Design a protein around this ligand. Structure first.
Ligand SMILES: [Cl-]
Ligand SMILES: [Cl-]
Ligand SMILES: [Cl-]
Ligand SMILES: [Cl-]
Ligand SMILES: [Cl-]
Ligand SMILES: [Cl-]
Ligand SMILES: [Cl-]
Ligand SMILES: [Cl-]
Ligand SMILES: [Cl-]
Ligand SMILES: [Cl-]
Ligand SMILES: [Cl-]
Ligand SMILES: [Cl-]
Ligand SMILES: [Zn+2]
Ligand SMILES: [Zn+2]
Lengths: 373, 373
């Protein structure tokens, strides 16, 4: 039985299970460290100050952020080792410099000569040191330099003392759904940075840090012994996309939207809830996988899965659950409450300015999301 | 040429064109009033205090809201006639009562006997008056009572003095893409409430207010002379879904995301921007229409459409624009800026805590979004 207070806040609202959060976090930390590396957790799934305390051993422990809004918030909270892992816009260099002048080791990411020259020009004009990763393309999906591209050498040389190392994200691993496919994708990700690192060293370039990761590759890679750090973030809570990939099952999913039944359609056997896309997002990641959960798997207020029930459709402020003939409208009266598991934790969390947290001791906490850019 | 200040805020950010906002608003007001009715504008697309000033003639003018967060914010700002147009959860009645005790004519919406009994029971226990609309199903898509359902009579009678009238939203009109189809859908919407109203009056029930509307039906209905009020909201800015339906063309779209080019892929002819789904949302409404704009139509910083260019893919904090062979990467260097028009204005605006506003006099304003529930 969930605590009585789940029924207190008006719906819809986001609910994080602290006990499951902590389990998910402990599992990956122990796994990566047993494989000879360490984590640089990514803060962008949850984007709360509290999440960094669960994920990081100390204020100086390496972390990843997806925005300078995050960087500024975590720096204010005392965190001093932050990789801003999105290709840098030159106009943001003054904000990066401002953090570095406050004692924050704020690293940036780039993959082109224009960005590298902007860093060098800024450094020259303002006397500012930078710490810079070059993005490597490991999965043919996003940015980064291919390991064999001669411009890898040119760009690293241009950066000189500001060059810190190599970073890749194999987000393409999300297409996988077998253990061997995942192991292979993790090896592809690591090999891309190994090859890039070898090409750098052959050319006389020192590479202080090699950095790989996504939740799937972090959970299935077999050898991180020569990789400096592994990054992951969505594993904090998991989601249905992860369930379908096979990184977790339903029991590991620590995020849900608490929703109230606000109507019925007797003719069509529908429940209408207050969980529209404004609460869930329109992420439909599971539609491209082998089990389509619509806009989320429906659960009881105690968290247990209601077989066969999903939020099939949404508008802005309501959702529709098409009941199967195994269910009766009468058992879900207006005012009854449910929990919806998300397709994509990162996308659903973006919709909530404040999260409610079921602490492992049964108590109720709230966390404020760091929003904007 | 757009004002120089568009290049000042860090990207991505949301930009509203005030001159176009004002034009779009003036057009519908004059149209509906010429057809013998008046507007109850919906505030949920923009959810700013400033939007209500553009949309409403006075603080007492009727408006629509989608959340009690909106209701509370607009009430604090002095607005006193607010229809909360989402089927009511019984636990929210105490918040509705609190507003009504402050002098706010806060109307609620319901479609089932459970909700009606909850209102009556609250009224009896706490001595509280309510103003209640019954939702009518006009489009077979969402909630509401069919006009011929005998429970319409039962529910209205149960409400007694709290019964204010009938409300429908023909969101199904969004499937239309011809002028005659839209005219017909508007007639279907109005006829549904006319029939319901006739059934009420035959049974001896007074119906103070009849309320219809969506942006498409408001712009194409031919006869509102016997309908109390017409509701619309997305027309404030329009969007690509509306463009495809044919309610507007590109020139009327008053919302865009300003984004910076942060990378290139030479092999594939890609631009990478800082406009991911965190800035645009994953609404893909145009994919089901006759012109798929991906995650948005790409425009120059001056607002003019770049033919053939869309944000084809997104991740969390970046977007990908696949260039056609009409374009050269060189013309969009890293640091170049673009504007992205949204699929769905309501969905894109949800992603932005603050909007930047290009005032009609060329100046720069900002508006704070009212977030949460
Ligand atoms: Cl629980
Ligand atoms: Cl380059
Ligand atoms: Cl696979
Ligand atoms: Cl999606
Ligand atoms: Cl249940
Ligand atoms: Cl919608
Ligand atoms: Cl402009
Ligand atoms: Cl009923
Ligand atoms: Cl049509
Ligand atoms: Cl969509
Ligand atoms: Cl341009
Ligand atoms: Cl994504
Ligand atoms: Zn994610
Ligand atoms: Zn909308």
């Amino acid at each position: 039985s969930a605590p009585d207070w789940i029924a207190h806040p008006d719906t819809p609202y986001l609910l994080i299970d602290e006990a499951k959060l902590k389990s998910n976090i402990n599992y990956l930390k122990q796994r990566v460290e047993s494989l000879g590396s360490h984590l640089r957790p990514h803060l962008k799934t949850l984007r709360t100050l509290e999440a960094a305390g669960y994920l990081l051993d100390s204020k100086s422990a390496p972390a990843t952020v997806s925005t300078l809004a995050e960087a500024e918030a975590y720096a204010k909270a005392g965190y001093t080792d932050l990789l801003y892992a999105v290709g840098i816009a030159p106009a943001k260099l003054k904000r990066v410099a401002a953090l570095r002048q406050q004692g924050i080791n704020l690293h940036i990411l780039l993959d082109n000569i224009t960005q590298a020259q902007a860093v060098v020009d800024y450094a020259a004009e303002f006397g500012q040191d930078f710490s810079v990763f070059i993005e490597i393309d490991s999965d043919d999906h996003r940015g980064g330099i291919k390991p064999s591209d001669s411009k890898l050498l040119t760009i690293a040389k241009t950066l000189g003392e500001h060059f810190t190392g190599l970073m890749t994200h194999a987000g393409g691993s999300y297409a996988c759904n077998t253990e061997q496919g995942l192991k292979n994708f993790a090896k592809q990700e690591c090999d891309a940075v190994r090859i890039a690192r070898n090409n750098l060293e052959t050319a006389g370039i020192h590479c202080a840090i090699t950095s790989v990761g996504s939740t799937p590759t972090a959970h299935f890679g077999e050898d991180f012994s020569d990789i400096s750090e592994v990054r992951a973030g969505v594993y904090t809570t998991f989601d249905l996309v992860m369930k379908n990939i096979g990184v977790c099952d339903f029991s590991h999913i620590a995020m849900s939207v608490v929703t109230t039944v606000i109507g019925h359609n007797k003719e069509k056997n529908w429940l209408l809830t207050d969980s529209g896309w404004m609460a869930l997002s329109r992420d439909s990641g599971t539609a491209g996988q082998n089990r389509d959960f619509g806009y989320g798997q429906v659960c009881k207020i105690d968290g247990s899965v209601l077989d066969g029930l999903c939020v099939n459709s949404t508008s802005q402020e309501h959702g529709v659950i098409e009941l199967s003939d195994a269910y009766q409208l009468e058992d879900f009266p207006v005012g009854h409450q449910l929990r919806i598991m998300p397709n994509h934790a990162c996308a659903t969390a973006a919709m909530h300015p404040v999260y409610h947290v079921l602490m492992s001791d049964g108590s109720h906490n709230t966390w404020q999301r760091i929003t904007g850019w």
